[PDB]
Each structure stands twice: as C-alpha cells, then as structure tokens.
Amino acid sequence: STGSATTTPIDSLDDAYITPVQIGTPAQTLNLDFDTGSSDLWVFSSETTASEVDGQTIYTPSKSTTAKLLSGATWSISYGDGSSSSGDVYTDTVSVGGLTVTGQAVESAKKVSSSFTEDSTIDGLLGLAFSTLNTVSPTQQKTFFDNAKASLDSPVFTADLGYHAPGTYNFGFIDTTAYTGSITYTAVSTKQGFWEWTSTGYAVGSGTFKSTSIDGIADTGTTLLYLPATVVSAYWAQVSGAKSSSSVGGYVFPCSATLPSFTFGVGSARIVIPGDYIDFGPISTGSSSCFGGIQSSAGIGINIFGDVALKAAFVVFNGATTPTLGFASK
Numbered sequence: 001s002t003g004s005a006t007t008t009p010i011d012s013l014d015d016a017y018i019t020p021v022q023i024g025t026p027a028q029t030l031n032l033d034f035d036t037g038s039s040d041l042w043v044f045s046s047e048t049t050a051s052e053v054d055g056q057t058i059y060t061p062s063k064s065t066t067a068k069l070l071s072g073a074t075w076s077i078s079y080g081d082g083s084s085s086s087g088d089v090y091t092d093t094v095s096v097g098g099l100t101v102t103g104q105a106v107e108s109a110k111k112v113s114s115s116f117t118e119d120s121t122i123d124g125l126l127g128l129a130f131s132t133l134n135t136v137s138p139t140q141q142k143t144f145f146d147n148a149k150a151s152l153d154s155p156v157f158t159a160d161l162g163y164h165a166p167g168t169y170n171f172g173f174i175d176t177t178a179y180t181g182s183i184t185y186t187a188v189s190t191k192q193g194f195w196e197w198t199s200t201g202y203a204v205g206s207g208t209f210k211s212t213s214i215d216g217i218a219d220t221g222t223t224l225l226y227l228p229a230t231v232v233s234a235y236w237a238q239v240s241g242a243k244s245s246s247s248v249g250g251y252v253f254p255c256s257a258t259l260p261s262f263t264f265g266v267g268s269a270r271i272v273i274p275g276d277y278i279d280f281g282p283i284s285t286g287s288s289s290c291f292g293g294i295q296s297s298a299g300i301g302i303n304i305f306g307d308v309a310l311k312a313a314f315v316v317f318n319g320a321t322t323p324t325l326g327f328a329s330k
C-alpha cells in the first residue's frame with residue numbers, strides 16, 4: 001500500500017504545516033501537525049477542557065463506531081518549546097492520504113497548554129519519530145508509520161515541505177519526479193528516539209564550505225534551524241545590523257536586509273537554503289526588526305534541522321531494519 005497527502009503552511013511564515021487525517025467511522029477529518037520529532041498521535045477532542053478549545057476541530061469518539069477506549073491508558077507529553085498536553089486513549093481507524101491503519105492509538109486530549117489553544121489551525125499532532133518515545137502508559141503505543149510499515153510497498157515516508165506553498169507527505173514510495181539529482185543517504189542513530197544524523201558541514205552564502213560534523217535531528221515539527229552558536233554567529237555576521245537579542249530570544253536582523261543563503265552538507269552532497277527561507281518577519285506587528293530562521297541550539301541540548309532546513313530538500317525517512325535518512329535538492 002501507499003498514501004499521499006498534501007501538507008499546507010498554517011500561516012504566511014510557514015510556522016508549521018497541517019495535513020488532513022481521517023479518524024473514525026464515519027471519518028472525522030482533523031488537520032494534524034506531522035512531527036518527526038515526537039511519537040504521539042494526539043487530538044483535540046470532545047473530552048478537551050472546554051475553555052482550552054478555541055476554534056480547533058475536535059475528535060468525538062462516541063460518534064465513531066470503530067472507536068474503542070484503551071482501558072487504563074493515559075498520556076502526557078511536554079515538547080521542547082515548553083508546550084504540553086495530556087489525556088486518555090482510544091484505538092480507531094486512521095487514514096492519511098488513502099493509507100489506512102486499523103487499531104491506531106488516538107490520544108484524546110483532556111488538557112492542552114495555552115500555545116495549543118491559541119493556534120486554531122492545528123487540531124493535534126501526528127508523531128513520526130520512533131515509537132520508543134511514545135508517552136502512553138502503562139502500555140506504550142506505536143506510531144502511525146510503525147503500524148503501517150509492514151503493509152507499505154517500501155518501509156519509508158517522505159517529507160516535501162513547501163516554501164510559502166503546499167507540499168507533500170508520501171508513505172510507502174519515493175516519487176522520483178519530486179526532486180532533482182540524486183538522493184544522498186546518511187546514517188541515523190535511534191538511541192534518543194529521533195531521526196538523528198550527522199551533517200558534514202556548512203557554508204554561508206557564496207563562502208567556502210566548512211567541513212565539520214554537526215549532529216542533529218530531522219524534525220518536521222520544529223519551525224526553525226537550530227545549530228551550534230559558532231555556526232549561527234558565522235551566518236548572522238554576514239547580515240549588516242543583525243544581532244542576538246536576549247529580550248526577543250534570538251537573532252534579529254533589519255527587515256531591509258537581503259539574507260544570504262545557508263548550505264548544509266549531507267555526505268558529499270549540499271543542500272542550499274535560500275536566504276528568503278530564513279526570514280520570519282517582524283518581531284511584532286509593524287516592527288522593522290525581523291526574526292531570524294537560523295538560531296542557536298546552545299540552550300536546547302541538541303541541534304535541530306527543522307522546517308527551515310527540511311523545506312529546502314526532498315527528505316526520505318527510511319524505516320528499514322537499520323533506518324537511514326535521504327536528502328535531495330528539488
């Protein structure tokens with residue numbers, strides 16, 4: 001089997017991407033944030049505290065003839081940005097782009113943190129990291145991809161995120177028309193539950209490539225590119241007037257600037273992020289100070305190849321017995 005679904009930016013900045021997902025019978029379609037950095041499929045629901053729902057579409061398990069409460073199961077998750085959610089668990093039929101999994105754990109939120117409530121466009125998350133990170137207790141549950149894998153034509157999914165435009169998540173096949181050149185594959189460590197890999201270096205604009213190992217995770221659920229402070233300083237030094245602002249929380253730059261590109265290495269291959277992809281717009285409405293899309297990871301504990309980086313590539317998440325990642329230009 002295969003599946004193919006369009007993923008759409010939630011706003012004009014590409015702050016996140018939403019993909020329609022069919023849950024239950026008859027189907028209830030919710031727009032979920034596909035997140036290769038986490039492993040829970042959770043949704044706003046008829047059980048979510050009413051004051052914490054503000055425009056989201058909810059899953060109502062009592063209206064699904066295939067929903068079954070997973071007795072005794074609860075979940076609770078905290079994300080790297082400080083947001084969180086928790087609740088109980090159903091199993092139900094879940095379909096993405098024509099690919100169907102029966103008995104998928106659908107984690108129904110009883111509580112969500114303010115950042116989720118305040119984003120009316122995201123109805124939940126669909127985790128695509130390794131199932132070892134799933135938070136369901138006392139019986140950990142499998143991700144959608146893990147449940148589907150054995151049925152897929154090939155045990156892979158691909159992320160093709162657009163810049164200020166829709167893109168595609170495919171399951172079970174590699175669309176050879178969706179990229180240019182070749183796909184370069186690179187080793188993955190699953191020891192932390194992530195799609196963790198080592199980039200071979202970077203360049204700023206037309207500058208020389210610096211060969212250096214940068215370990216990080218391929219994370220579709222993170223907006224920005226978080227890299228070591230040395231790398232980030234080298235980038236922003238090429239933007240006149242750019243500075244790190246403690247009050248804003250990262251590098252900012254004059255909105256009048258033209259940003260240089262940023263290149264990262266995948267083996268001997270090179271992925272070029274155009275400068276425009278690094279502009280996240282005014283820090284507050286009407287400001288002439290703009291927020292940068294490349295930020296230091298120093299306070300995180302891990303480097304993160306988030307959407308800023310991934311949207312410059314066609315990315316293969318290869319879930320073979322020994323997983324690997326593939327990157328192609330497009």
Ligand SMILES: COC(=O)COc1cccc(CN)c1
Pocket residue numbers: 010011015016118119223224
């Ligand atoms: C440092 O991370 C960011 O700035 C990500 O910003 C957003 C992430 C998701 C949604 C929105 C707005 N609904 C903003």
Ligand SMILES: COC(=O)COc1cccc(CN)c1
Pocket residue numbers: 037038079080081219222223300302304
């Ligand atoms: C704005 O959001 C972030 O910066 C995310 O931070 C992370 C920190 C550690 C691990 C992960 C991936 N589970 C994400």
